[PDB]
Structure formats: structure tokens, C-alpha cells
Symmetry: none
Subunit: 116 residues, 8 copies
């Protein structure tokens, strides 16, 4: 149903893109393999490491979760910045569930290391 999300915004100028669209599409991730390690680097500016969680379902995909809430002040024009985030990522080389996963969140950037 990802396509359905994009469609709702076809009328909109790039200034006006919805928050709901952003929740779906965020985050952008680059992911690569090096030395028996599968690394994912995602982009989540303005979030707290307590609110970020990562997991792998039995099906071979990697999952990312993040919550935040934002206080609304004054005359409001934009609600774009996403509160909730849920991202499922298909995995090309299935890492063992047992293998440890380490995530480091720095400078609005999330990095995840996964052993092969």
C-alpha cells in the first residue's frame, strides 16, 4: 500500500507534503556489506536514542521503530515533521537471529551493524 501513500500527495506542491506521507517514507537508508557485517545507515534528525528501537522478525527482514512528540507553538503552517516511524527492510543475506545487533545514533544519523 506504499503506492497509495505517494498518490495522496500528487496534487501537492513540494512545500506542502503531508506528515502522514513523511511517516511512511522516512527514513532513507544506505545499506551495504563489509567483512561479514551487514551495515544500515538511516537518517533521523531530531530524535532520541531512548525512543529508537530495532528488531528482526522471523521472516528475514530488519525492522526499525522510533517515536517522538512535538509541542505545537503559535500560528501553525506545517505539520510535516513525523512523530511515529515504522520501517521494514527486506534482507538480501539473512543474518542469524542469534547474532548480536549494535546501533549507534549520532548527529541525527542512525547506524546499525549486523553480523552475517
Amino acid at each position: 500500500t506504499m503506492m497509495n501513500v505517494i498518490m495522496r500527495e500528487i496534487g501537492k506542491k513540494l512545500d506542502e507534503l503531508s506528515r502522514e506521507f513523511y511517516e511512511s517514507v522516512i527514513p532513507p537508508i544506505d545499506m551495504y556489506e563489509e567483512g561479514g557485517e551487514l551495515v544500515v545507515v538511516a537518517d533521523l534528525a531530531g530524535f532520541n536514542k531512548d525512543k529508537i528501537s530495532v528488531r528482526l522478525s522471523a521472516q528475514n527482514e530488519l525492522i526499525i521503530n522510533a517515536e517522538r512528540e512535538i509541542q505545537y507553538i503559535g500560528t501553525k503552517y506545517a505539520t510535516q515533521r513525523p512523530l511515529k516511524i515504522h520501517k521494514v527492510i527486506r534482507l538480501p543475506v539473512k543474518v542469524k537471529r542469534d547474532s548480536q545487533v549494535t546501533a549507534k545514533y549520532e548527529n541525527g544519523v542512525l547506524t546499525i551493524r549486523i553480523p552475517v
Copy 2:
């Protein structure tokens, strides 16, 4: 018999599953915009960029323009490259018409 129009649609659904780098370059950043005390605040979620590289300008035609430049080394075999190398964001201003960069979040204060 079926129709071509349906088949195209089924295809686009497949296509839009995993978005390009270029896509995200065009959409980023999501912004919050409010008016408090005769000041306009634009709040942008940016994957970390060096502060000096990030630039903000007010356009002549009542627009706000947000650019930024990044360089990334694609070490090893790359499965995906979603992240945006470059950014151009044009933002219309609601009302008639000083930047701080913290935790990858850009907060722009505009006098009014």
C-alpha cells in the same frame, strides 16, 4: 482479455516500493512552520550535514531556499543508496516578508 492500464498500475506499485536516492533528494526535508512573536520558524530534519555546507537564503519572490552538500564513501558492495548527496529545498512563505543547526535539525528564525 484484460487492459494495459491495469498492468501499468500493477507495475508502478512494484516500482515505488523502494525509492531512489534522487527521490529523497527532492522530498527532504520535512518541515514545521509556525509564527511566534513576529518570528517565523522553519524546522528541518536533515541527515547530518556539516553546518558550514548548509546554506540558507531568502529569494526575491518571497521564497525561502534551503541547500546543502554532502559527500559519502560507498565502502564495499552497496545494496542500497537512499541517502541524498545534495539538497535543494524551496519553501514558500505564508506571511509577508539567523540559523541554528543542532542534532541534524535545522531551525530557521525569520523576523516579522
Copy 3:
């Protein structure tokens, strides 16, 4: 100005449509040629890699021609792209009126399926 999302969407789909899904082909394949000659409607289809037994030809109750074929493909090694169709269903609505049952026959050579069906009003 600000930019159009629709533009972005369009720009996105293009580069992606360079590589087409296996499903897409399953619907689109085969190409055929259809002509009337000697009171007979001949149709020729490109179906590479399906065995003769697996391919089926049926005359529909509606005035249409249906080609059905299925296959199983071994998938060794690291698969990067798998565009070619495993199972085919194709429906063609005939341009002229044809005899209802059983006269059409099929020939399959060089991966090419040839059907010859007798037109209506033909003379034996």
C-alpha cells in the same frame, strides 16, 4: 518554484521502468500475428521455452482465443533478475466470426506456436 511532487513521481517511475517485472511479462507475452487467408484465421505466437504438452489452446464460449501455458524453472546460484514468465494465460478476441468448436490446430516449432482456425462461412 517549490517543485511538483507529481514531477518527482514521474521522474521516479521512469528510471525504474528500465527494468520490468516478471509479472509484467506474464501479462504481456506473447506477441501474435493474426491474418485471414483462404477462409481461415491464422495466429502465430512467440512462446520460447515452454514444452508442447504444457501449452494448451482453447476456443472460448465467447468469440475469443485463449492460449495457456505453464512451466517450472530451476533457480541455481545468485539470481539478480528473473523477467521471463513461468505461467502464461493469454486472451485474444477474434476479428471475424469463427466456427465454434474443435477445428483449430496448433503447431509448435522453434519456440513458435502457430494456430490455424477456420473462419465462419468457410467452404469445405
Copy 4:
């Protein structure tokens, strides 16, 4: 451009697809790598081996060309089967100069190009 070949056929039903489109879209390829060889498999019915030409570009892409002539008889309604095939394929695995092997059977074209390393 490929999308423009697709968009020109939107209205039509599946029985009515243009030959130009099929020329643009044929063949469907199966690509995988094994035994230090990258194998391409394409569906290409109604062609002669002498007419089928395979070249490898300077850029990463691999190109398949095929041509044939057609002999229409009588009143024709459908003419969809493609006369000239030209398919440029970007290959993921690394391959400037290489030794390519191609065998055509039963409309099926099998091309084997050796990737760096292995065997």
C-alpha cells in the same frame, strides 16, 4: 523513454498491443551468476542464429540484437511479433574486453559471460 513506449499503449487491451512496444520490450531476461560465470537467459522465438548478434559495450551494459523478416499473407489483423530486437542490459557483476558464449535453442537464447574471479 522506455516509459514512453509503455504510455503509448495505455488505452489498448492486452490483445491489441503494438509491435513497436514488443520490439521495445522483448526479450524477458533471466540473469544470474554461478561458477564464476554470469548467465543471461532470454526468450526469443522465431529467429535464426545467424540473425542474432551479441555485443558487450565499453560501459557496463550488455547488448542483444536480433533481426528478422516477415511474410504476411492475406488480410491481416494483428502484426505484433517484433522484427528488430535491441536490448541494452546493465549487468551488476563486473565484467572492457571479454569472451562471451551464446547458444540458441527452442527460441531460448543463453549467454554466458565470465565474472572476475572464481572459475
Copy 5:
């Protein structure tokens, strides 16, 4: 803006069509003119006559404003009926309007 409203509901089935949708859509109007008088015909429902407001805020514009409050008892499964209506028809100086049995009618020179 108006096309953006339509596109929001594209995923949804005809029953699931949102409230915000309906607020923008309502009312469907029929416009005609008799004897050099202009007449407007609009389908508004479940609105109190006092709450409804009509004026022309531009030289050539028609604005209809309408508001209501709805309190929902029990578990509510859907809420499609609109709270506030701000349709802005455009006129192709005194307007007389009586709203009865849903139908709201406006009379212009």
C-alpha cells in the same frame, strides 16, 4: 488545493470517505437565473438556521458559511457528517435566503 482534497481519499472505499473530505465538498449547488434574478440551490443537512451565514466578501464572489456541533453517544464507528462548511461559489447587491427541509436557497439581482 481542491484536487488535493480528492486525492487524500483515493485509497478509501466509498463508505470510508472522510469527514474533512465532506466539509470541503458540501454543498452541491444548482445555479440558475430567472427574470434578471439570480437563484442558488444548495443541499445542506442537519444545520440550524441561525448558524448558517451568507455574504459576498468580493465584488464577484459568493460565500456560504455554516457551522454545527455534534455530540456522539456510544462507541462511534464513523464520523462523515461535516461540522463546518465554507463553500465559496463564484458569481458570474442584495441576497435573500430561506433554508428549509435541508435545501438552502439564495436570491440575487
Copy 6:
């Protein structure tokens, strides 16, 4: 710059959507509320300008509730727009398992088990 056809299509549909099709409205009507109170399901719907005799409410063999109504209108003088719907046929899918209505002031209220 040459411009884009798509940009031209979007602009074209947009100018036209301000005034919408009466046939579009017919699909859309009515906006309904569905709540459950007193072990009963209630529907409130907005169908202004339609006669009580014209209105029909039926229940499906399927789970769905179905509202049917109809009306007739004659337009006097030149008509600039005729957005009003004439042939409504709403259908609603039901959340709670379900085998009776009152209409006033262009509003329909329906009660079900």
C-alpha cells in the same frame, strides 16, 4: 524550458475540479455517522431535498446496509451549474455482526440490531 505535458495535465484538471460533476456527487452521498448505543447500530445521513416517499432503505444479503433514494428536478432559465445529485445509491459495510428509519430536516436516521 519546454515545459512538461504532465504539468499541463495537472493544471488542466485542477481548474475544472472547482465545479464538480453531479454524477460524482451521486456516488459520494450521503455522509453518514455510524455508532452503536443500547445494543443497537444507528446511522445518521445527510440527504437534503429528497422526499420521504422517494427514500428507500434496504438490508443486503451480504453484510452491507443499503440506502436508496431518488428525486426529480426541473431547471428554469439558463443553468450555469447543476451539481445537485438526482439518483443516490449509498452502500455501507458493517463493523459489528447484524436482520426501521426516520427522516426529518433532510437527515435520515436508521436503527438496526
Copy 7:
């Protein structure tokens, strides 16, 4: 087949590279208006010969405009957009007599057609 389909095919195109097929279906833009007990249709149809254009009044109450021409392409061609065969079918706003004195004059690429309204002297 439909008008919508004709537009859709060109969505992935810039304005300066629009298909000829598209132009054949879309040409000509017309002005249509009733005045003086007559219904006037003004069409923009350049590069044609009057001998090639024909006007039909249909079984249904619609006006059909047909035109056709040949253009031999000289040299190395980069763009062939201009229409070869026009077949514009226009639905009339008002009922008109079919047994009617209709006047279609071509001048400077502009086709002006006049049609008597039913019920006018």
C-alpha cells in the same frame, strides 16, 4: 479511443516533443458560439488545402470535420509533429436542421463554419 487516453499517453513527455498521433486527435482548437440565429464554429487548421477538408453533419446531432494532407519530409528529420489526418467530431450544444445551408470558408489556416439554428428565420 477515448479523449482521456490520448492525453495520458503523453504524460511522460515534455511539451516540445509531443506525439503527432496526439496532435491528430486534438487538432483543431475551436471557438463555438450561437449568434443571430446561427451557430458559428471557428477552427484553427493551418497548412491545409480546402479541397482536402470536408464537413459532415452527423446522424446524431454533431458536426464532423475531416481534413487530410501529405507532407514529404526533406532532409534529416528530428521532429515530425504536424498532423496528416484530421477527424474532429464536435457535439453540438443546440439542435440544428440537417437540411441546412451551412457555409464553411477556409482562409489563412482558419476554418469558419456557420450553421442555421432550428427555429430561426
Copy 8:
């Protein structure tokens, strides 16, 4: 129950059946472009414009710009105005040409024929 998509298309199709005058101002004119004799020619169907009112200019970005303005006086009740009043077609040129290059354009029977010297041409 029906879907919004099916509903939307039905609406979309309706809005396209009859086309705006603005629409045509975008799409007009159709052009034929060929190169021969080391010069580039653009021939365009531009029916019903005064020759004086048409302007042709070579852009800084190797593209061709056709500008046409005309005034139409409407009479009686009007049921359609598809005819474009203002035209600004911008055409990307497939071969480098001189910005400085002298240009000739001819207007006859509502067809605009424009010839433009290609880069590397000899006068």
C-alpha cells in the same frame, strides 16, 4: 460498495473531454523539424495570427522560442473558446546553433516556417 479510484477516474475523464483554451496555448503549435543544407528548419501550424504579432527568438540555452499574441472579440453566447490567444512555445534544438546567427521566418496560410543556421555552417 464502490471505490474512490473508480470514482476519481470517471471524474478525471469528464474534465478532459472538453479542453481549456489555456491548454492549447501550451500545446500549440505542432512543429516539423529537419536539418538540411547545414541549416535547421522549423515549420509550425500557427493558424490565425498577424505576421506583425509573431516574434521568434533564439534562446541562450540553444532552444527555439515562438511567441504569438492575438486578440479575439467574442460575440453572442459562447459555448467554447478552445482557440489560443497567447502562445509561447519553447523547442529544444537537436543540434548546436549560433545565438548570434541571423534567422529568417516566413508566414503563409497560417504556417510559420523558420530557418536557422546550424553551428559550423558556411554563409
